[PDB]
Amino acid sequence: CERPPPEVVQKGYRGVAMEQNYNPRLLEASIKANLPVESLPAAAPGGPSVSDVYENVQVLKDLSVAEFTRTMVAVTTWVAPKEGCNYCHVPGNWASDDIYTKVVSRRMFELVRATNSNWKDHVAETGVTCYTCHRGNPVPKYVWVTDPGPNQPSGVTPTGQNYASSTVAYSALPLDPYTPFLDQSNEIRVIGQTALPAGNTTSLKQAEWTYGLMMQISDSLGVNCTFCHNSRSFYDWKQSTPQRTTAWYAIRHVRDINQNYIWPLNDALPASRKGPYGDPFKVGCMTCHQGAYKPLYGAQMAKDYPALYES
Amino acid sequence: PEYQNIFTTVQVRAPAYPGVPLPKGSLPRIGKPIFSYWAGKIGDAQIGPIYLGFTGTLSIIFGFMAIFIIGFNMLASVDWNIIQFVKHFFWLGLEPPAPQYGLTIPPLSEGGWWLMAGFFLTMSILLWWVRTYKRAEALGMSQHLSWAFAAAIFFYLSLGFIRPVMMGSWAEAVPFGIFPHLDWTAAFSIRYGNLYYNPFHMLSIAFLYGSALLFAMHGATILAVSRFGGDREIDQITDRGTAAERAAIFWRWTMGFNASMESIHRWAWWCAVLTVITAGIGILLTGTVVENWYLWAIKHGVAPAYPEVVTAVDPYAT
């Protein structure tokens, strides 16, 4: 039970009831849990370059030593503040790559740099930072693996649904929408776009899979369906909101992250970073947004770090 | 204040009524009737006896098999954990076959158990329908209840049998579960473009709303004139008293027209029956002759248009 009034944001036309309801005290608690980190002071311009000073810099080679040092200090705060600088380095040998965290984090830099430059249809100049997912933790708090579901008898084929799961906001919908949609590229659309039947053979069961994905999307952003849809026509882009267009690119963006960045790193990662099916911890909508319509409620951290953009 | 005839203040006990005698060759009614005091405060105190004939017995056996199969598969779905069964009970269900099987019989855990539960439940419902037909016939009564039950059965068959057969897939049918069949209901509307725009869904709601309207009107009306013995509706129908006159006159003065003590039950019967008749028809039209109800409404000028204050760029149209 909550107490009224909520903070309501109207998205659609009056009387159409396309609105976002926020409990102000729950929203206050969420914001305090999604605060950004103050940017480090700007590095001194000029000075020695990374290329002619450091030995094994393969991604950040376009920077100066001052900005490179500032970047390493920042990613230490963002990823491994408790473990310190030695979490991703062999002690006494910075250039050494003989530690899996160094290899993973180098690929993570390419992930962030590609995101901040090639996925502005989604991250729209806000960009991402190592902190957006990690939030000061070496393992991001909100990651997913392919879920086998509840245990089944050996001779029972799992349905993957009909089981209360927080992944689908505690409904009985198919509890693992991440694998077919946020890692694989299964078709999300299920609704026929003609008045009369014209060959759309999509099963009703496939609508429950899309519904399960949409429950996870809305839970990840802390929004309801009307944040992006007019529920009287879920298929219709003309009656949708601009956030639906952003979410469309986000789905492709997450697939790009999981397929091209997380999956190739599977061999490097230890067994503790993998699910029961052997897949690594992967990125979902919750990984960045963590219950907010924008990660860190729209805080702009990436623009203060030129190392996080492609050259 | 004035006695509202909502609860029976003083109950009177008489020897339990065995029932109107049934014709020769009928099984005796089973059960020794008892008298619940609290049941007598709101209604009749006597519980029992019940008639359990051959048809009722067969319906019980078929019905239990369906319920047992459903419950067993629910328990299997939580890997036999009875504690997890209770926790997830509302979320548990027996899923219909996967779409790739069409109308064929899949393995047990891939929809085979669902078909058996669906068939056994259907047989028990049909057997229960025969039982309602025979009980009315044994008492010399008409078959209005059987007709109304058949209407409800028609909608039930449309949900789980007729429409899935028309679609050529058992995956279109309803899962056996509390929350799963609600997920099916929501997914059905989503999949076929907002069932709100199905005109037979609109009619079904009008009659479901009308059923609550009529029973509220009729129930309050009879309680309002129960001080004149209005609850004795058979006597009022055969020999119209002041209760039936005042009831009819109230509604004539209120809305300009009225029913009789008998015809109000024809309005009641048809409103309830049309709820599931239109429900069944609207289900049969969905996916078979209409793919998207909202687009069907647009085609027929039913869906309202709103000013375009918010819009999304279509990423497929590039």
Add this chain to the structure above:
Amino acid sequence: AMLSFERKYRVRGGTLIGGDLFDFWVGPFYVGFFGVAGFFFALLGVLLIVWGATIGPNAELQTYNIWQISIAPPDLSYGLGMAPMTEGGLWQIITICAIGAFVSWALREVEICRKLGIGFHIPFAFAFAIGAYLVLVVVRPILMGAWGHGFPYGILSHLDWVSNVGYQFLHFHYNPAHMLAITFFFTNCLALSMHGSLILSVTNPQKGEEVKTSEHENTFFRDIVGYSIGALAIHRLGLFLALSAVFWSAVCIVISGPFWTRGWPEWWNWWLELPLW
């Protein structure tokens, strides 16, 4: 005209307000003071609905298609204040007219009940329908903090409102009060068909049969389900089921938004998080 047995019941008095001034009949209708007030409340509300249709959302979207006619409430930005007539203010006046018409209709039924010397169950039952309407357009909008939370006045547009409000909680079927309200609605429809069938099957028996008795009614459902509620109590039960459905529907919508902002399935996390499992 009047029913062939009606003239002996047309008596003066029983009015709550107005006395002899408005105590008369127009055709079959009794008017009274609240019939006059209710008629002109309804007349103004209907005429403003037609005028709202005449101006429409705008000139290009204006339509007289009865399905597409829609009078929308104000934007939420107006809060609980009055809005301009073409920006939701018409909806606010129509809502006031609707409340006036519904209450006048209920109060006119009270005067008719007093004339006939019958119980006041009917106006009492109608008050539940009015209360459900008041929750939709007054109580919930006030709790939410804006008149724009009321549903628009349109045959199909108020269905779009119900759809979008339902999906503001991502899966509205999991609303516990909604589930209880639906149970009463479905049970009421079942109980109405049973009651209508039993009365019709007894007063219209098999061919060449006499009208059955109350024993046949009690015996019939005892033979089927083992219990008969009784001729009087089925009307209590039908009234209770119908009013409980509306009461719990009013609860279900007033807790959606004011007293609950998350998805409705998440509400059941209290049960899932019990330490028993």
Add this chain to the structure above:
Amino acid sequence: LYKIWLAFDPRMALIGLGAFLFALALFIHYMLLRSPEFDWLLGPDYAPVTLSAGMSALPAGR
């Protein structure tokens, strides 16, 4: 002014007045809880969260 108690039942007047005052008190307390300025349940040392770097508590709407 004993005339009031000649025309109004003391038991019903007190039940009505007590219910009215209790309902009025509950309503006014809630009216203060609605306004965050007078919402004492936020704590005496309540400080609103600071939004920096372009943060917005609510998504943009209409």
Add this chain to the structure above:
Amino acid sequence: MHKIWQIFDPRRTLVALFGFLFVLGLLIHFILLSSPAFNWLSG
């Protein structure tokens, strides 16, 4: 035995017995049809 029919109604018992046997027969055929190894209505 034989006195079992002095406590069991032969009329009620046979219908219950035949109904159970019919349900059991239907159930087993359904299970075999569900089994790909024993479904006799395939190629």
Add this chain to the structure above:
Amino acid sequence: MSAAITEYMDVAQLTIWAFWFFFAGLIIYLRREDKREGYPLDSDRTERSGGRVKVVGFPDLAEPKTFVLPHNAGTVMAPRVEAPTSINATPVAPFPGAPFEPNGDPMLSGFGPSASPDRAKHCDLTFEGLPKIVPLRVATDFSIAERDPDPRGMTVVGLDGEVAGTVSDVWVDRSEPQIRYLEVKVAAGGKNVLLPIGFSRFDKKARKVKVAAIKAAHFANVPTLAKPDQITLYEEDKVCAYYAGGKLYATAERAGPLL
């Protein structure tokens, strides 16, 4: 077979239109069943034409249907024709739609809330043919439930709190075991009159029956039954209607208005 009948017509559109034709036919049927009671209507339209115009509206009346009453009590036609009846009242004003003022004492006028039809002058019978509404003195196997207070011996008070009598006996429905009437011994002339249970508010703590309908002095004029141990359908309506008139006629303040 396709979903499209023409470029614009489709199966769903034909099906909904098919329903409207059925629904229109159904409403006509139901309205025809509604008009089996109280038709043809009584109107100044008929009165001014000397019965030449029958007011039935649309749909017109249906053919008479037969109810064969059990125990050969007769066959009653629903769309019957009743003899003209004269009301015991005069119009307050001559314009059509004006109400009527009851003549004489309103409680004894048999008009308005005290009006009642003349039902059949025979008792309602159980399935076996015994009278249904009988006092507990002849329904010996009937008894008050143990947890409920026995109405016998309770004091009956009127609208004003004045004692009207005591409950001498309880009348019960034999077919459905419920209380129908309280036989009240009037403490003014020692004549027992029936009090319908619908006008009775039990006060269990004080063993008192409160009758808000009428005053204590009005119990002397309650219609009485020919046979002390059974009541006909005719007399049931007369008793209930008399109490109903009290809801409008017992006090001057009950005629209204509040303001």
Add this chain to the structure above:
Amino acid sequence: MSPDLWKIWLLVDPRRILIAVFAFLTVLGLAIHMILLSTAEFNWLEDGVPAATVQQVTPVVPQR
């Protein structure tokens, strides 16, 4: 503080008061224990101390 508090049992039934008190105390006791188990701070079974000796040796599903 009340010398004649024993007169309360002339108004309220001793058996119904005892039944209600025992029923209400039991429900209150269950509720408080359930509330404490619901919290991470006062859950005495999952708080770690006395240094739980059970190992979760299995690939975890982080989203659930």
Add this chain to the structure above:
Amino acid sequence: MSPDLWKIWLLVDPRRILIAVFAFLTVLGLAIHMILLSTAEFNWLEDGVPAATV
């Protein structure tokens, strides 16, 4: 420890107390076992100890 405590059975029905006590203790016993089984530390069936057969 009130010496005159046996008079409680003059107030509450001994049979109804025994039925309620046995019903409550069984439900309480089931509830506590369920609470322990839902925890990782005190689930004596899934804690591995002793050894690991499966």
